[PDB]
Design a binder for this molecule. Structure first.
Ligand SMILES: *[C@@H]1O[C@H](CO)[C@@H](O)[C@H](O)[C@H]1NC(C)=O
Ligand SMILES: *[C@@H]1O[C@H](CO)[C@@H](O)[C@H](O)[C@H]1NC(C)=O
Ligand SMILES: *[C@@H]1O[C@H](CO)[C@@H](O)[C@H](O)[C@H]1NC(C)=O
Lengths: 429, 429, 435
């Protein structure tokens, strides 16, 4: 919609802002059911296709016994725990029969379970009605039985190669018409209904299908859908690249890299920080993330982009000497960390080189630039529309005396480096 | 069984014990074969479906030319080497003919290869017999040929998008009736037969299907199954979380995290340590692991849970400054590392917040607890039955003088930190 | 060719040389199109099979709205950025019509887009021609009309299913997205050199794995997706694989021991006067003696980095090392043997199938060739060695860790080098020496 991006020459980092949040805060668990039947050449094909039915039920029975930079700081939880709790209820006596009763006259029904969870239950395939009413005979019957048995066969195979938990949720587990109607009857706000409906493919990837139970001639599996409790708050993506001195002797050079790269989103007076930005999915200017992949930081962490030396937040950096050249493709441009004898250029679609990077950390916007070359690596830039702003600044690495600079600090900060410099300075005195 | 769990307040860690081992120590390689045939509307549908057959054989021929926290300490090996060694033998002249001979009158046959490996060979589809007997014509025949060609096409498609090696092994590569009979005829003990048969889904997940050879009208691929040479020894899971001081100035705070978290299992007088606990699969109270993902440690490593300062094992720790809050969901509870201004609570579904964590490292059991909230993240606890024991203790981080404490140590130990403190204390004097 | 391997006892590392390069340096974007149609008991099967057609089109419209050791030193890029840029062009007005017009008389056609990118457009399935000619029934003469519609609709349903469970980006590219006959002709009509044509054709399975299929657009009754194929700008240059393992002292007190590991392990290939270094060797795929890598997973280093295997103390390149104390035993299975780092009380052996244990590794770092060796055991872990034919050379040498004073040796250095360790030792030695 309106994406902007600022590059900070002083800290060799860039922030892409203008995005809107869609953060997964809750789960909606629904129970999907398939009603099963206990049981010339046109008849031989029927028994062969019926053996597929009996082998799929055996697999599901034999599968039901299988009960369901700063990223290392993250917590540890189970993503499907709320879906497992619903599945544990279905194993209670008379609970599957409660679902079987509510879907007797209709396909969509809201069922309140014995543990108080009111789930929205679906009957998506009626194979007991088909197989039992067409059990009288034992080519038109052969083809239509393969079409109705196909969904059961594919649901079973997806569960077989995924321990009974699949993500993203396929059209076999839940069709678009079923998912769209499930969203409409879902007890959520109108903003969440419009968001999930306009992005059903993202909803599928952040959803789970959990194989549950097959008893009393009923196959039931749990589809666990994301609930976005945070919508339309500001998000911004922080890109970082190593910032080194560019002296002629490489042994006297020191480096510094901001380690707080990832996705940031405003959330409930704090900031939700996703250190491994691969765990978020971007749709135009909407970013979908799971709060399980996040750290909760003070909102003052944003100040590191403006003044990395601010007294309100201890900005995190590393000081590993990384004297090799690399590039980071941002949202609207490219950061280039060019060091040593590496050839660092930016080229245009048809004409070739239009910018030659010198040693140090620099930036080029994607306007009129299509590729970036660093050594023998060719990078294509993102061609999304948006404005880039180059914030000139003295590289902060030039403020440090190399003789007392603490190199090889893995997870440090501005204050930690300041503290270690004083100790070394004390030894000098 | 009876899962118990101890939380150690002194080192911010918890051990879940009561599990039984099932460690992959060996491989069983079997050769799966499909006998192939060399080569109006009822005739046009056949020839287009015959083009699918010729395109799958071409694909498999074109695929046969494709010859088959502490986790960074692990070794490097090839998981499929034992299956590849069998596949290299099948390319010798007359070796495929021996298998074709032993499967001439039956589907199950044990063949001793030219390298001395007595493999259990299967003929799972006799497609040469079908195409040759129904080669006379050149609608009932069209449908039965789609059913007869379906398994060959799906085996080819799984190999095409997996470089000829698939895991888990699908029901197309090996059906349940074939897998169960393969287990029964497998030269193993009755205890291992019952374990694999009661856990076929885990066996599939820890198995490989290796595309091998397609010559002399025979398609042959190797299914490599796990052998659990370590069964029913004690296992326990170690959870760790950062332990920091809680002084009023955040710059004067120091942290410490046990780095030895993961799965531990007794094995042959030593302990098999799996540093990335994601590489193990837990079924009720049995834990399935592959010894390739393990380090072999002295059994005295258990002493770190009772006395982290013991003289018999140098317990491993890190000292990265962790000013962030997080939680670890254990087997019977939750560890909460709460620092700064973060809201850290444990709530009940209907009763609300029942524990408010203060700054530091603490623990809550799952008894009466449903969720744990740390900042903007909600964690669900396991509702598994079991007793938790809270071992009160002074957090060991309080024993260290912050002025000589070595922060930012990535892979340290109790002795290494003591050594750097002595050196720094020596420099001062 | 001839795979050889040298083990350097001094640095606990081994180099496997004799490989030939096939490096992904660029991307080629092609546009694959499917022409679509805007629309008794045997009549129920057709419309039920026709509901699958409209449900696949609904998915694709609803999917088109979703527009897409030293490895931490690597850069960060978008792998499909070049294909997304081509797809962004197809969303322009009248751009699909240029493709729709150019594919009117043929299936293979080169189309010049409005921004000058000359893409190679392909039409692989004509479903508008079939549905329009068989639109008369909408009552059906025979069942054969149902079966041929299941056969003609099968590829569209499977392309949609692969896109549905992959956000519209699939890799490797399946035979549904592009068949072998289509890929081989796409390779032949691809404007590349004859060496690159022969390389891709004899290795189509690798080409599929290093390719992307990007769902793009559904407009004007045309389904179009972009298949992004690898361009191998570096072929047949020498490559070599470097294996490393921890090198520690074996003193009687386990607390007085220090360790050192070469961190520059990975794949190396000569490339344009420099060396392309792939620190995570899992990102390369080896076919016999040819190695396929992506330059996006590489660093461009001076060629003097090779000197670290012969003289780790050379003045021309600062060889990279770590000094984390790794008091555990481990093994690395190389191309023609095995490196074993054995420490403490661990049992470390190499055995034969029939002859038994033939080498027992002692504390420290050692190496055994695959000649007569079938397995390597370290503790409770069994590793199988490569049975490939080739010569191993054991380069005797004093382990360099014995050259360091343990009392001033800087342990727990995550990403250091020979000079960085020397500089930290001097500072500690200077403080001691001034006293
Ligand atoms: C340590 O150095 C930093 C550098 O800015 C300074 O702010 C701080 O006061 C110093 N502290 C001591 C004890 O020298
Ligand atoms: C090293 O530290 C330990 C524990 O702090 C202490 O027992 C020992 O005496 C120290 N060594 C020296 C030489 O001071
Ligand atoms: C640093 O150590 C090297 C030997 O490793 C020596 O040649 C050099 O003079 C030292 N520099 C000092 C002590 O300043």
């Amino acid at each position: 919609q309106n994406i902007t991006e600022e590059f900070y020459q002083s800290t060799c980092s860039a922030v892409s802002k203008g995005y809107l949040s869609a953060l997964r805060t809750g789960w909606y668990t629904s129970v999907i059911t398939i009603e099963l039947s206990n049981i010339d050449a046109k008849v031989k094909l029927i028994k062969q296709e019926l053996d597929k039915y009996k082998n799929a039920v055996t697999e599901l029975q034999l599968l039901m016994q299988s009960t369901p930079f700063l990223g290392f700081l993250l917590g540890v939880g189970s993503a499907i725990a709320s879906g497992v709790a619903v599945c544990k209820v279905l194993h209670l006596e008379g609970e599957v029969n409660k679902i079987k009763s509510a879907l007797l006259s209709t396909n969509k029904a809201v069922v309140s379970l014995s543990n108080g969870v009111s789930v929205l239950t679906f009957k998506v395939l009626d194979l007991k009605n088909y197989i039992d009413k067409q059990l009288l005979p034992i080519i038109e019957t052969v083809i239509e039985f393969q079409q109705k048995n196909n969904r059961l066969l594919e649901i079973t195979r997806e569960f077989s190669v995924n321990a009974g938990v699949t993500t993203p949720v396929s059209t076999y587990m839940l069709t678009n018409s079923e998912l769209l109607s499930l969203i409409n009857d879902m007890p959520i706000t109108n903003d969440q209904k419009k968001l999930m409906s306009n992005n059903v493919q993202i909803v599928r990837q952040q959803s789970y299908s959990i194989m549950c139970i097959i008893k009393e001639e009923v196959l039931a599996y749990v589809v666990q859908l994301p609930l976005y409790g945070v919508i339309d708050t500001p998000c911004w993506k922080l890109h970082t690249s190593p910032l080194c001195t560019t002296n002629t002797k490489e042994g006297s050079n020191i480096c510094l890299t901001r380690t707080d790269r990832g996705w940031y989103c405003d959330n409930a007076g704090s900031v939700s920080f996703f250190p491994q930005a691969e765990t978020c999915k971007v749709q135009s200017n909407r970013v979908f993330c799971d709060t399980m992949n996040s750290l909760t930081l003070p909102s003052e962490v944003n100040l590191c982009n403006v003044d990395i030396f601010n007294p309100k937040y201890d900005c995190k950096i590393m000081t590993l000497k990384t004297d090799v050249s690399s590039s980071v493709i941002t949202s609207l441009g490219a950061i280039v960390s060019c060091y040593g004898k590496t050839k660092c250029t930016a080229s245009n679609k048809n004409r070739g080189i239009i910018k030659t990077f010198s040693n140090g950390c620099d930036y080029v916007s994607n306007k009129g630039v299509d590729t970036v070359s660093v050594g023998n690596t060719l990078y294509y830039v993102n061609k999304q529309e948006g404005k880039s702003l180059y914030v000139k600044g003295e590289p902060i690495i030039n403020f440090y005396d190399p003789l007392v600079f603490p190199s090889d600090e893995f997870d440090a900060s501005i204050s930690q480096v300041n503290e270690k410099i004083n100790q070394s300075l004390a030894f000098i005195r």
